[PDB]
């Protein structure tokens, strides 16, 4: 059934699984019309499909052309997500196909279950975890490839850079969720923490800076402090 704190280690076992987050698929700016009504303008979006064990990210870019002349877009966005995840699974060799897909939002269960009827042995699961994958578009290189896309495109990343050379999947996921939680809570402050020191750069083939093991401890501390401060403000406690 549902993925929670109790069955957390299951993410890092040897059964292939993917998280799917649909929160950046359908994106809009709300604006005033000349007549003083309100309208939306869609911008490019993305499906965030992640193997938490390997860090492999299947970033399917959703170009605004897919919405042209369609109705009920927030509903269609769930079905289009399920269509693209199903297409991704069919594109993978059998030995690479996931045994489970975990959706970050319960509204994705029926769309994904219906698109995956051909795969009765792939379990579609919700999660009780509040994962910060919405903040994916705060990672500058992911934001850049989505906004520049002129057509539907799939781009492959490793969201852990080279971290698995030094740390376990469990620790790499913990670092990723802490970075994304900070970027979600206070993007400006998070981004300042990550770049403040100009001597630490991002490799061309990486998403995050080339921190030493000691520098990651300092960074991780700075992200936890950002999150607690923001929380004391949010709630006056």
């Amino acid at each position: 059934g549902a993925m929670n704190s109790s069955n957390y280690a299951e993410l890092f076992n040897n059964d292939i699984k993917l998280f799917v987050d649909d929160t950046n698929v359908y994106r809009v700016t709300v604006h005033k019309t000349f007549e003083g009504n309100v309208a939306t303008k869609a911008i490019n979006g993305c499906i965030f499909t992640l193997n938490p064990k390997t860090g492999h990210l299947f970033l399917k870019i959703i170009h605004t052309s897919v919405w042209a002349g369609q109705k009920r877009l927030s509903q269609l966005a769930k079905w289009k997500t399920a269509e693209e995840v199903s297409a991704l699974v069919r594109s993978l060799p059998k030995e690479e196909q996931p045994k489970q897909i975990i959706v970050t939002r319960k509204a994705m269960l029926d769309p994904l279950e219906v698109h995956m009827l051909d795969f009765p042995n792939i379990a579609i699961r919700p999660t009780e975890l509040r994962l910060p994958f919405s903040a994916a578009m705060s990672i500058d290189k992911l934001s850049d490839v989505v906004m520049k896309a002129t057509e539907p495109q799939m781009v492959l990343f490793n969201i852990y850079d080279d971290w698995l050379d030094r740390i376990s999947s469990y620790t790499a996921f913990s670092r990723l969720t802490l970075l994304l939680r900070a970027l979600k809570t206070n993007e400006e402050s998070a981004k300042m923490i990550l770049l403040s020191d100009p001597t630490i750069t991002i490799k061309s083939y990486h998403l995050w800076p080339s921190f030493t093991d000691e520098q990651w401890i300092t960074i991780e501390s700075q992200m936890r402090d950002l999150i607690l401060t923001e929380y004391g403000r949010k709630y006056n406690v």
Binding site: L76, W79, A82, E83, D110, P111, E113, V114, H115, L117, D118
Partner: protein, 300 residues
């Protein structure tokens, strides 16, 4: 007017005949039911006074043969049997009638209730849902499971209702996932009506039989089948106008007949709320919406 004689009544039992019921005492000189209207299926049903668990009964049509009830002290139930000797049977009924040891099927002349609940129900369809081909009548009870319930365990004692599953390859055309899930018209009209049932009369017959098994025996799988067949129509944007008008009449008489005290276990809140207030057909079931709102406003 046909007769179902009883050999005897050796155990205290509540006897149902269609929507009517009578208490019979242990060894009461009861010898059966007369004046049964020809032209409809009927159901004769039992609930023992000493074990109110296992409601059970027999679907039959008096045009198909001469049927009687006899208690079996080994299997501990009232059994239906066919009498093949016409003259023996006529002679048995005439004697019991002469001695007035039979209850009369108590139909009010104004009262179309049974016709309205059984309009599309045909014995030949019942015998394919309830498979026991050596008998012309069909045994159902409280505990019998459906083919669908068994898939999710004795096949010979199953209710073979048509399997309906909204998240199945049968229900969803490759490439029309969202369209077919949100608008079930292709599943209703091509797969079920044209494909399996052949016409709306067979579909309504199964719907009506599922409801009556739910109501008379508290058969849980029957109740699931009745709601699934309602939901498949209400969840279709494209339904023939005659089918919607007929569905409103069918459901109206079902809700009208349901014991007020059993609404809590026989009616699925989600299905009814969805069918009357959210579905494509939210505005197409005027009679049903009015009786549900006046009789079961709690449910909604």
């Amino acid at each position: 007017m046909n007769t179902v004689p009883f050999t005897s009544a050796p155990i205290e039992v509540t006897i149902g005949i269609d929507q009517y019921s009578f208490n019979v005492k242990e060894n009461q000189p009861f010898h059966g039911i007369k004046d049964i209207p020809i032209g409809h299926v009927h159901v004769i049903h039992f609930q023992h006074a000493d074990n109110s668990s296992m409601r059970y009964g027999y679907w039959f049509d008096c045009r198909m043969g001469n049927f009687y009830i006899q208690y079996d002290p080994k299997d501990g139930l009232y059994k239906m049997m066919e009498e093949r000797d016409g003259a023996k049977f006529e002679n048995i009924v005439h004697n019991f009638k002469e001695r007035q040891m039979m209850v009369s099927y108590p139909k009010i002349d104004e009262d179309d209730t049974w016709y309205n609940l059984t309009e599309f129900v045909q014995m030949d369809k019942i015998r394919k849902i309830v498979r026991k081909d050596e008998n012309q009548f069909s045994y159902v009870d409280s505990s019998m499971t459906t083919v669908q319930e068994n898939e999710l365990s004795d096949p010979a004692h199953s209710l073979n209702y048509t399997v309906i599953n909204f998240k199945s390859r049968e229900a969803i055309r490759p490439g029309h996932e969202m369209e077919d899930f949100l608008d079930k018209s292709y599943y209703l009209n091509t797969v079920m009506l044209q494909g399996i049932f052949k016409n709306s009369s067979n579909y309504f017959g199964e719907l009506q039989f599922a409801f009556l098994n739910a109501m008379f025996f508290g058969n849980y799988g029957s109740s699931l089948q009745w709601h699934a067949m309602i939901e498949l129509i209400c969840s279709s944007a494209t339904v023939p106008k005659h089918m919607l008008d007929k569905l409103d009449e069918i459901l109206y008489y079902q809700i009208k007949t349901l014991p007020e005290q059993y609404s809590d276990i026989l009616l699925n809140e989600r299905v009814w709320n969805i069918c009357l207030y959210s579905s494509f057909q939210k505005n197409s079931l005027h009679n049903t919406e009015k009786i549900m709102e006046n009789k079961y406003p709690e449910l909604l």
